[model samples]
Target chain A: TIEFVGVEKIYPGGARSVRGVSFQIREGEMVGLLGPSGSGKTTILRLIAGLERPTKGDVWIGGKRVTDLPPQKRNVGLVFQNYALFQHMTVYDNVSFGLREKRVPKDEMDARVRELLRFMRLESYANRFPHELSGGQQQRVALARALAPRPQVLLFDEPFAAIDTQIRRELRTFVRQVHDEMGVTSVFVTHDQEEALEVADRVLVLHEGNVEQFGTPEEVYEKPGTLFVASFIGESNVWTRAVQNGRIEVAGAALPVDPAVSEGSEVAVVVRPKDVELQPASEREAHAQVVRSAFKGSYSACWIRTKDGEVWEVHVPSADRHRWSPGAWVHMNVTRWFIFPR
Target chain B: TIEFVGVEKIYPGGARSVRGVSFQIREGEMVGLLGPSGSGKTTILRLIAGLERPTKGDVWIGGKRVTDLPPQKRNVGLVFQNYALFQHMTVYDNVSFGLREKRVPKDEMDARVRELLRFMRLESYANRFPHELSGGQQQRVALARALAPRPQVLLFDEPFAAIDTQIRRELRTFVRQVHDEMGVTSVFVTHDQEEALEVADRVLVLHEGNVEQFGTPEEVYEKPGTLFVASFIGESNVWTRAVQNGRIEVAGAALPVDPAVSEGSEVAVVVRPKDVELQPASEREAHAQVVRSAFKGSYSACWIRTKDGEVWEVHVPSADRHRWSPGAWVHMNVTRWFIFPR
Candidate 1:
């Protein structure tokens, strides 16, 4: 298990990358560090890997204080976004480099390297150089090399960021399977919320250097605690509405509140686009019209505008898509909603 | 309007980059020239810009033939993925370079450059160099330069490829709005289906140097003419099945066949994930257990393996996601399915 206690990081030139970030990753659990650019997600990875020491707080891994330890002696594996494979080395040599560093016998090293190659389904590519392989193949080599020494923890910094969407999805599933089978506590840094939610057991949403929200994918997606988390994790419409008698009045439509809040206070309601069902104009209680619709194969995104011209998004089933057209008046219903007080 | 009358392009390496591609862009319409890498999308752009002459066929712009015209005299503007800004020049200089080339008066050139800078919302960054600006700013500068000369036909070759997704979306929408507002005939090339569908008025799907389909965004998304278009435009699950009477059998289950298909023949059913609906198990139908579930915000993706161990993806509304979980049995109903003959 790793715990970040009041950790703060400051880079040269007065760049405050991480500011008082704190989170915990249980042992044998796969966690994703997710944020957008300059979110300080990478700085946490570096601190965990012992590549950079924090200016404050501490990092505890497996109940051991290794915050100031050298990266080579930290017993952790790191994979970079670019794969960072040694171009001059063959696949076999790349996998065996770490084992050789530990002074394993040549025969033992060969057997270990062969086992890793077979495990990664890259045995046939052992003789190929890094430059001779494709992006996916090179990544497999890097993963094989990272796991050759049987490290306790595996850290990846945007491992799939360089790959296209199709290949990235495939690799994400593969990584999840590997994590389950190997039981290697993994922490990967990425700016893509979709990647984190799909591949990790829990996601740590980072903003600046602070941990915004850390929880299971379902919990974070359905019941976000903060407005930032709600907006960043998915397409959420934040509406400032008045709360009266435990009911929230939004855009002249009143609805019962969940986890009830006090009456008569301004609050921001978070509603997922998919939860906002569209009905015919006659059934609509509030003024709304379909601005445009986009077909995403698995779902449809409809851009809607209110009477006052405030834009909101709604998602509908592809089967029901034909019922709605641009400029069609429709009623939007919030089946499930989350509210955050200002 | 720009028309390609049976354009054929063959490189010296004996590769037929494009073969008999014929299409017409309506006046003031934004059309996407889309294809994967090496599919001749870029080659077509080059030919349209008059940078390279087509081996066969002629090109007509605004009712005038310009197949043999020089690039500068073609009244076409080119924007590349790399921005292709002059490294030694300032943003103002780069935007005014084309005006200077046409030998416009100095005062007129200055006025036009400032006007473009203001239009692109880059008036503050006019004196900055390309190296000093971020990718989004650099792209705006490039756009300003491309539109500064007021070319009748604007060509963009993957202009948003190098930027991040958020910025890319903003830039594309900005470009689309500008094109509509200015009534510029634009041709943008990209392999990304999402970008094409969301930004262009019409899309031309290219495959193997040939035009596979050309239609409006909704038309291509809902009525793909070929297997390639169906698979490339979105997530399509193809199942080879036998059709009897007016129904098709898919994995031991009967599905309604599209009426356009002939009777009593083998067919391939292509259904988007969003078209499938899930119901609770009842006595009338056998329950299928969900093997995996991924929450994608707008919708929930559940993979259900039937009794025979056949896996099918079900995309459902995220609000009703509690009923579907790993190992939970559910009933599936196909709401909107497409059938294609094998």
Candidate 2:
């Protein structure tokens, strides 16, 4: 288990990197720290790794406070985007480096290295240098090296960013398999929303040195706690509408709202592209002109400009019978929406 | 219109970069040249821009053979990954550079630059230098400069590769709008499958300097002409199965095949993730254990390993009521698939 309690980090230059961030990660659970660049995600990860000390609060690993410990004393395995393997070391030596530093028995080290090599399907390249292998292969070697120490916690920072797309997918699945088999408590840091959502058991969304939301992927994606969280995690069309008679009115369409909302209050509504439905022009309360229709593999992204001159995106399955062309008139309706009072 | 007839490009180093490529683009259509790196997508785009000459065969633009024309005579507007603007020049001057080179009247050049700046939503940044603007703003300035000359054809080579994700989406839509309003023949080059599918009217899938598939996004995605195309275009689960009684049998279930295919033939089956249905174990056609189930923003990526030790991916919508955890037993049934005889 890992815990961050009221953690705040300020650099010597007086820049506050992390602001009172707190969270608990259960044993064997995988959590992702996600945010755009300079959002303090890396700062949080560094805090856990003991590379950075918190100016306030504490960091606990496995029930022991490690806020003052050096990186090597924290018992955390760190993997970085660049792999950072010794250029001259063979794959076998790279995996055995940590074990050697700890003075593990020779026979035990060999067996563990061989097992990890087999697990990562790198047995054939054990004798090869870092530069001799491909990017994916190098990343695998880095993973093998990190796992060799059997650390109490595993940390990955943008592990798949440097890899190609296809190989990234393969490695993502491989990482999940490794975590499942090893049952290691892990935290992954990434700027990609999809990677964080799909790979983590729970996600920590950060923004400008603070936690915007911390929850399961479903929670963060579906019922986002803030407008920033909603907009950052997925494709969303946000609009401001007025509440009238306990309903929000937008483009001649009235949507029911919570009874507690005051009448005539202005609120922001978020609509997912897939939740927006398009119908024939004559059959609806609002009409829009199709600005563009793009055919993605499983679905079509239809861009429509409403009568109020606002653009809304609607996603229709590719298998659907109806096809809208540019400049075509269509009626729009939203199936699901979340309204937040201003 | 732009046309390539039996085009082949060979460098001085004896490397064949493009081979026997042929295609025709209507005057105002948008086409995407898509492939992995080293697949010659950029080479073909360069050929259209007259930056590279075909060693064999011909190139045509607007019903005229342009095989021997230099880049300056091709009347093509080109934008590259890096917004290649003069660093010291203000946005207005950068946009006016092309019009000035063509010796347009000073008043006309000013009016044209102003119009382009307005069209690209860069009116407020006209006086800003390239380095002072953000990445998206720089890209908009580049686009404005490219359109200042009013070239007959527009070419983009990974234009959004260096931009931020959120800005990339906005720029893609902006590009579409610009193309629609200007009615200029355009071709976009990218290695991103989703970008290619969503931004172009037709996609040219290239592999190893050859055309793997050429069709609308729907045709190439729904009914891929080759295995490479299917794998490259989307997430697909491919398997080899034995044909018996004129049908392919996989995991104890029989799937219908083409009538012309012979019995006892071996075939490869392509199953899209969305089409693979997961149900309770007792509902069964085939049983598999879920290895990992991830919540993507709009859907869940369920990775299941079959009895034969093959991993299959199934994309279930987030709205689905059922959620499976690791090691859960489930029955799998494919609703639609493509079979290719070996």
Error of 1 at A324 (Å): 5.2
Against the native chain B, each candidate's TM-score is 0.91, 0.94
Candidate 2 lands at a TM-score of 0.93
Best model number under TM-score: 2
After superposing candidate 2 on the true structure, give the runs of residues whose Cα lies further than 4 Å from its correct spot: A10-16, A244-246, A257-265, A282-286, B10-16, B259-265, B282-286, B321-323
Best by DockQ: 2
- Candidates in order have lDDT scores of 0.79, 0.85
Q: Give TM-scores for every candidate, taking all chains together and pairing residue i with residue i.
A: 0.81, 0.93
The reply for model 1, stretches above 4 Å from the true place, is A12-16, A86-133, A237-272, A275-291, A304-311, A319-342, B6-16, B51-58, B84-138, B238-251, B254-271, B275-290, B304-312, B327-342
Chain A, model 2: TM: 0.94
Question: Would you give me the overall lDDT of model 1?
Answer: 0.79
Which prediction has the highest lDDT against the true structure? 2
DockQ of each: 0.35, 0.61
**TM-score between candidate 1 and the true structure:** 0.81
Tens digit of per-residue lDDT, candidate 1, span A1-342: 888888988776333388887778998899998876667888888899888899998998888888788889787987877458899999999989888888889998889989888878898899999988977788888888888887889999877664645556657767776776678899998766777777777999887667889998887887786788887787667778877778786545677765457777778888877778778774245468776676654557787888777678777776765677887887777777777886
lDDT of 1 at A239: 78
Model 2 Cα displacement at B109 (Å)?
1.0
